[model samples]
Target chain A: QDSLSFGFPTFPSDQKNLIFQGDAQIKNNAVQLTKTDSNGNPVASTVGRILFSAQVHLWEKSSSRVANFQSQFSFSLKSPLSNGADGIAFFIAPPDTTIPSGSGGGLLGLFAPGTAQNTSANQVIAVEFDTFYAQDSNTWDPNYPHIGIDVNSIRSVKTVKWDRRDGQSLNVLVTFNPSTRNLDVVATYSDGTRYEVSYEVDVRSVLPEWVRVGFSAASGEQYQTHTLESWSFTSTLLYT
Target chain B: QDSLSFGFPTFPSDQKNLIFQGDAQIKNNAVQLTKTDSNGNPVASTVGRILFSAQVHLWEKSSSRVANFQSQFSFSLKSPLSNGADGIAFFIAPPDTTIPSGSGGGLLGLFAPGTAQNTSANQVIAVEFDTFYAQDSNTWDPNYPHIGIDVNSIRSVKTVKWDRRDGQSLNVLVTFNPSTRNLDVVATYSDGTRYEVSYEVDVRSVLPEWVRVGFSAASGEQYQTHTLESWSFTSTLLYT
Candidate 1:
């Protein structure tokens, strides 16, 4: 059994082994990636935002014959303007660690806009809180704050307008059960409303046997603050 | 032993027994109280702030005879503007669960100005992280980012200009030992600099036997995002 939880615990060293890149900081025990600075400037337009990858591999899917895992955390997206920009994502990426360049705005800090076309090549799967939907043809629905699941690309496999207040906890729970080959997501609201989506994702098809689980958040020229308040993951790993 | 620690852990129910008021929610495993809404408005200026208090009394100083305690947490105050507004506070207040009317901006959701000139009635002791300071004579110091300890009032018994980057962990440790009757406060930064302040706060002089412990944050017209990453407290309870 393997499990990990983060709520910004106290440590002689803050952030500990969590790899922090770009505008991310372990503040108030949570990972704060980007926002207006003390001078109140939106993060730089140049690769602006933050990415945090847990130092330890979440699990070796190839080594762990059949795995079941679940993760849940609270998050908030905010801006002073009428609308926010960019967004955040929960992702599982290959062991190699490097922030994709020019990955701000709709890129969501996961992929480089033009250089990457096929997401599968990146060896990543992500669930995104997309806030800057431009009401263009690129969006699944009208431009609004929403949640989406992405594999290899920001093109969502599923998308839903996120209906929760800012600074309020939007609860998200994601689980993958290999036995059933299902990845299910459920988001809850303080108002007692729930939004759910599910997909059949063969772990072998999208990510490596061993992967790192963490989060990435960004703010473009049209910026806002993104944060992860707490996160927990549990899985069973097979050992010979 | 009376001790409580919150790092925003995963639970079957978020903020079940804990009391939540105003715009607060238990999400992502931590308590997120105030921020802009999904629609990007400054969280309705009507008593617009968040409060989270443990359902238990921190301690009965009068009954305990001797009380020694220590608490530490990480926090960040941010906004998309040139300067963040109002602030947040960690407090011990008498067991009344209600927001003080008109408690926004410089009041920091802790006190109601004008109507209440006498704070002793509130029976509150708090440490505030105040971000707005306009070098006016009425302020404790030239308008700069700062922290202050207050008894019954947001007014500072001792205030220090806080120097730290925004969205970074500003570590705070507050301890009170009955032997010395001193409440020592220290703030640490990532840059290896530390600020320390101490006061002989005879608990007997203020507060009743029982108190509630938790945090409160607000954003006035000059709004900002305030967050607490983790918190821990330990103390002994005195039995009659």
Candidate 2:
């Protein structure tokens, strides 16, 4: 086969291709990216993430030809209160990239607390589902319940209003087209209602030849649990 | 069969046994109880209700015996924002009860706008999924996102926190026992997480012998749409 493909309809009990970091756990047969106490109550101020254990061949440096990827995942973000703090991101980062310290809360576990919002300290490509509006922090947040495209920075290069995307298991389809140099993300509900956002950027410009692909989510004083129910990803690489 | 039962897996085009009031409509095969303009955007400050067309004989006046009933309904409360305001209720009132004027916001379409929280002028039995907590109005409301039992007043006789009850088709089962005079309510999510609340109150004391039953919901400045996907009700009346 010319393509690399894998699907997890549900997480396996043996934790096959998955890696859990920070507070992430495989509970309730899903990837839980938040801390839960012994009594099963959510703990605030935590950072959690899950990643594919193996890196993907992202591009060929000699040809500068990047891979075209299609990613589909099912997830839910639920809070103890009516609204939760922070958010979730399906991200791509360098192989063996260590999580920066003080990366909890609205940082989404990608940015450093000491770095300014405009700095390019973080190197990653991500599609973020942000549920909180951090007006005081000056992260350049557009609005709460908005989807944004983040590349090498936490500030989204583009954002679209995300309405009715809470408290339920939802589907997100992210696709990258190297031919068009575009990244498209679509969030869908069980009733078939959907919202979409997109941005244009060639991944060869920012990422190395190989990178890790997965999810990172965080919670602050206002807490919620992010559950990764299933993920299916496929990609093709060509040096042409 | 000695039982009276009706079920709608989904609402039909004919809208049988259903009455739409205010801005309520049969849209996308569900009872959409809010104002959606021609452009299909939710309008703020509105009241909408849907009721069973026929009167429910809740009790027999000759024997003072009340009917035991089980009412199950599927609903969703969604907002443009991360959080929605006001609430929805499954209620039973007199056969010809008119929706009180100015019954928007946290009033939940059951209470008079000018009545004090302690008044008993509103004669109805209702279980409400209240999404807003109006501390300024001093309705003696509990925390936000709570389920409450209302006998004859806006203030609930009991309240329980309802976590993760937004943005999806959720199930609520409300049952009344004539023998024990207990009203029980249970809310369940597809993931099998459920919350329960109940109160002991004889329905004959608050509602008439003949009554109407269905759903009533309202939106305030913080707006949301409440949808009634399916409803099934069954009851048995005895003159013992």
Candidate 3:
């Protein structure tokens, strides 16, 4: 993991690589992706994203590229409503400084309008914790938020109904290995059960040589607060 | 407080003005100033500091000056040891971007050797939560850590013995009224009792035209983790 190894047991100020956009608030050692605004009131049409843009590592295109990487983070999603609208996602995208406009709710601020159809163009791969089932062919349900491994589109390669309670800690681990071309995700619930999903994708085909990595979360008609408690990423930096 | 008002219910990347130094980690909606190192072991000497330096509001010697300001933050100091070492401090200091060297142990990272004698020279004023009694003529004890109002010196102007438990939430409020030249500090314990101390010092005499405000903590020979759970600062900003 010498090529690219970093961990944030707690993300505070010294993390100069972290860039926040939209409605994200880093306070109390948690990254509140969407939350109530000042005056202690929730806002409408909220989207928040954080990008770790410190260094451009070899994630794609180069002969020397990341062969294997693992990331783990803990978060708590709490909703005032019976069911929270929208959700959070861990993503790798182009090194753009701004959140995509009109990317709230299901878009998770990681895509451009009409661009998701051309998956290679968006240059984004995301693991989404979708809290709401947008009416589509994806068979998502209002009561059953799901985990989605997204490639440009919210149309997930794999989906699993979200089963964690509001405010409960969910420890999620995502691993990518180029040799196997396999992406593995596992989440540990507070009650000690594990949910997992795996997908196969070629990293070099969908992304550029260098990209930013971080998270994005949004809220729609219904609202909730998505807070990232801790995160750690370790990768084998590839060099020719 | 229109010109320079700010609050952090939590401190994460969203706090653009905050700067972290030393070993501070921000996660779980709290800033852990000192904790286990990368090897999962406590370091012999640990120090961490976070500076909230958005705008250099009018706190110095200008006609258009800040008349008053108030700051409040909640933190918990816990140690595996029976007693914690060193302590935490809320300080306003020069616009240095990094923590001072050799700032661990009783120094609390806020002073230079022998420089505290000239209060205005260091250009700092702090309210310290001293967890250990650094032996001095000022009457400190093992059973009693103290709240010290320091002007360029850890040797405080007014010292009150601390009476709070490890891991207990300490809600601290510091208010400064320039007209009265009074700095009033009140810390509310988890048990509901309040400990207070007041000192008279002209802010203009000890600070520059602009200063950075934030918190700093250190672990000496004996170590403990100092954590800041929440913080908010409100003040009137004077325009030129």
Candidate 4:
């Protein structure tokens, strides 16, 4: 008979901040989110949302199994992005204490657009696959919460937008250029047609080199928030 | 909303050996053997038999996906084990063969013991969960080849008398200890009865490390062989 085999040691703790094991829990829903250390802080607070975007490299067949590998740092918003809440965003963060957006459509206190409860300017520029427009009717349109990349919650910039004709099968190629402080977000379809866009910001200040990158979703009042999926990330150490 | 996420890099050229993807073909009641490597020797000289094994690990409740994240080396049988002919052994090698063993049953030499006549010892090793005792006179058994390791085309050692009595499930653990050059074999039944058996031999002298681990079964002959399942594995570097 044969013997045994081996594999690489677990991603080192220092290298973990970049690997986003998609399905993390926020409160009730199963959305994918990664938080800094154990604090579960939003990326904006810890690293300063300096880089407005991150990239998810795709090669293997996508499976929820791959997405739900970790229970921490990954959670979902109920009701899809089609519902009342803002769409989801992949993030890297520090400890956050903003009151959980109680009940419906509060942006989980992460989205401060047109709200006085701007308690979190913590510095996250979301590669917002924003499906629903903030504070909109709770009605569901297949295209209600189309994808968009949002910059600095404070500046509230919408750098790119696209219609997710096939939301379920929507795929994208996003890259972050830290030196340029710009988020290059590109959406692609199964057929290979791609939509490219970018957002400019400094991510180092908020989510540094070693920080958790995860996803978050929110829908409220009538529905629960949910995260369809999320995954961990790792990056090459480039010299400045 | 997020792009597809794969933990490791594109399946290494070698990992493909572990993925039995689809049906392997059987000609002349034997697993036709073949191999090709662009980087090294572009030949499929038999290295001996190959075997693939796994602990059910975790699977989805309502899914067809088998979630086996951990990889370990198990066992294999080769020519050296049973004369000069390429014997069998549990192994994990690169995918370059054209055996009918797809992802499931074909893993165990399509699962019919002695159904195929392999001529080389350089082929990969597949630890099959065999269900058919070819001599049982049954074309196939849904539960017989329950567990057994195999090398590619070399010699294949079976569990101590497969007793698939009364629809009971079988639990077996096969280990290859390098220190003792022994094959440690153990088995348990749903009834909790356990058995331990070991065989002594020189392993490294046969199949070297770095092969894909999997299982294969054959049924379509006077019988049919199919693999119920298989998992991936990685082998540590051998000092000897």
Candidate 5:
């Protein structure tokens, strides 16, 4: 009996599977993560993150079968005025994916400064929604406001604008195919405008059989905001 | 004709009435005001602004009549991650309202620190959408994510939660009534959620008879953003 299914129409007051760090809160019935001090003033050079408490199965070593996963969620990015940087992501990491700290913008809350070079045991993969355009500063991004595929590093291997309209519910769909090792992402605007981006990565090499599945976002010297309206995730073993 | 009207279904390739400062750009068919450097990385302690080149008439001394005006616009404030501070406003200021600089979070792009306070020549009135909850710091804000009435200072005289659902094209309606010296603001979510706030101010005392009516916003060490999808404004002088 290998079945994993979970959903959240709204945050339950006693949510046990959702872990919050930094300024993340469940106010207004949504998973709100933004940088702010006790005085309610915006804090610069900050970061926040959220993760599911339950671990996710990424592969089956006994049968050499990789897990194909699918996830969907709605989120928002807003501020006092009309500007901000960085973005958020849906990531699958090593089962012991530690919490991120001392992190700032462009690091994506998944890596610290001087870290994340795709050269270490940083086994992780993510689908990012990047809003900044620094595709060349160490080339950490691409033509911004794009969806991307990230390996062990913050830099993206694939970048394409999500074509999202601000102030509209943004829906993101992520699908993984183990047979082809393709992670496909589709972002939809409230009006049905859609953008797609995908990449190929060997999960067996980047993650373990049992991994952690959740989200991570970081704010830079500027700011960033993230919210999760509803989310559903499932993992399936396809082919023999 | 003593008539002033303006609208923007989308940003034109050539725009004169809209003046941009800092990282603000006119791409994506909207007034994109956010803080970023050429490297496409988020810059801290930054601010950006937008204004209309045209000036607005506030009151008439000859008839001792105040201008009752109505305005509506669609806008968005988005960041990279899921967090941000400060907010935006629709303001009526002295005819010679100056552009803001060296300003950061919570200033609203109207006044600098130690420069606000209703006791100065900074004659301005604004309706604000505040996201931070630092109502006690010099009492600059109130219950957050609220609509507010601002006099010459950043501290709001009135505050109420906007009930705005993020990711929805927030529509703002601003109306002034000279009969009661009231400036009313109504914010609507895409699905019809509404939030209302109003305040009384003697325009003759806070602003010159002729004034500048435009949009202004500021980002702090963190970040902020603003966008105007469409806007229309009209002023009527009644009650001889």
Candidate 6:
């Protein structure tokens, strides 16, 4: 129930591991991350983890910046990584040099105005779960970032609250099991469990292949800067 | 246009090449073959030629001699050696001595009468195009020993035949192209225009990995002793 079957072509076990180092350039909702492993049939992972941690500065929301900063970094796990979809999502915005004044609806507030087609002058691009109360400001879409399972669509295919306690720390972890094809996401403090959301993604139908997995962030001029901690994922595939 | 896809798990390319040698023991319809090369992905072959030939003696079919020896090795090129229906057909049979003779039809006659359910008598198997009309006498059953395409279903398949050449000293060669997923089967005589049949099997949709290539032949009382000649096949599964 808490596992996933993410199979990808595997390099030989005796060779170097698949690792994507440094920053990536996003172009037209796409980016290429290169890594190679020894050759063999698509292999399986008992535990599939995708780990990434970076400090992203949303410089501006204008034309060039909009196209450059307006995009998300998706991860392609298997195949020619170039020939797949954007598997995961993570967005932190502000377009400024500051780490922002803390976290809030100020999410993308750090970004400049009149830039992106989707964001407002002080819009928010929350991670995991969103709690901002401006747009569809019901009890559901306000103030904080939310986390959930997204499929062909991105608006939380299935979501739960943020998992971190105090709801301020940027410590989020998602665990998946290839044997069971289940995904468990936890966004709580390493020490405490009183976090924002605890969610799960059932992606058996889509695993066992090359998938792009990564995070994203957007900020307006108001919010300032946002940084990532660390992320890692693993999965497996079965063939007869 | 008359192409088909056979979804069989591929084998390691390193083991793809071998001389199938053994006696046909009385076991369930088991298909044993070899594979070579050790690429992580499935062994892929296009623009390559593969052939199977054998001399078999149909000892079981003969009522007079201790071992009626009428046997000839046959194979299906660019096709999956399948095992279903009745008797063991030699596309990828074991190199043992338990040849199938007449569970229903005259073993190896390619067309003899007598039908038994699941009898390990005379019957052959091929993946590309079936030619054993006696096995699949009805137009609806595509599993006959003749050369026919096995795609979405066994029934709605394609066939390959020789125009004017007889079965004496007959040789069939299949050429495959990975780029177009095309299979060209050429049944030639000592010298002629090379009667050929072309099929477009979407290898990508069928075999997802490397494939094992091998050959098999059996002779019972009804058939004469047939000998296995030289054979060769090449696959694109290079290791890093």
TM-score of 3: 0.49
Per-residue lDDT for B57 in model 5? 53
Per-residue lDDT of A64-134 in model 2, one digit per residue for the tens?
Answer: 66788888998988766777767888999887875679888888888787772554566788898888886
For model 1, residues B1-240, the per-residue Cα lDDT tens digits are: 132323332211223234666665544444455666665333434233333333223444434555566777777655567666667778777667477887766776777766333665567778887777765522543367777788776667877887636667778898877777788889888776787877788776786554566678877667666656666665443343
In order, the first chain's TM-score in every candidate is: 0.83, 0.93, 0.88, 0.51, 0.89, 0.39
Q: Which stretches of candidate 2 lie over 4 Å from their true place?
A: A116-119, A164-166, B1-240
TM-score of chain B in each prediction: 0.82, 0.93, 0.88, 0.44, 0.87, 0.42
Q: Which ten-residue region of model 5 chain B has the weakest summed lDDT?
A: B1-10
Candidate 6 Cα outliers beyond 4 Å, as residue runs: A1-11, A14-240, B1-132, B135-146, B151-156, B163-167, B218-226, B237-240
Worst ten in a row by lDDT for model 1 chain A? A7-16
Measured with C-alpha atoms, the lDDT of residue B192 in candidate 5 is 77
Residue A208, candidate 5: alpha-carbon lDDT: 74
Per-residue CA lDDT of candidate 1, range A1-240, in tens? 132223321211223235667777655555676755775445545233333333223344434555566777777766676666777888888757468877776787888766455764667788887777876623433467688888787788778777636567678899987777788989987888888888887777776555667778876667777767766555543242
Please provide, for model 4 over B1-240, each residue's C-alpha lDDT reduced to its tens digit, 9 standing for 90 to 100. 111112221122222122343333222222322222333211222211323322111222222222222232222211111111111223344434434422122233332235343524344434443334444343332323344444444234544444433223334455554445555656566567765545554443444322234433332222221211122232222222
lDDT of each: 0.63, 0.77, 0.72, 0.34, 0.68, 0.29
Identify the runs in model 1 with alpha carbons over 4 angstroms from their true place: A1-13, A39-64, A135-143, A238-240, B1-240
Docking class of 5: incorrect
Residue A91 miss distance in model 6 (angstroms): 54
If both were scored by lDDT, which would come out higher, candidate 2 or candidate 6?
2
**Which candidate order results from sorting by lDDT in descending order?**
2, 3, 5, 1, 4, 6
Docking class of 3: incorrect
lDDT of 2 by residue, B100-215 (tens): 88888888777777772644677888898888886875348875678889878888888998874557878989998888888999889899889999889877777777677888
CA lDDT, candidate 4, residue A41: 25
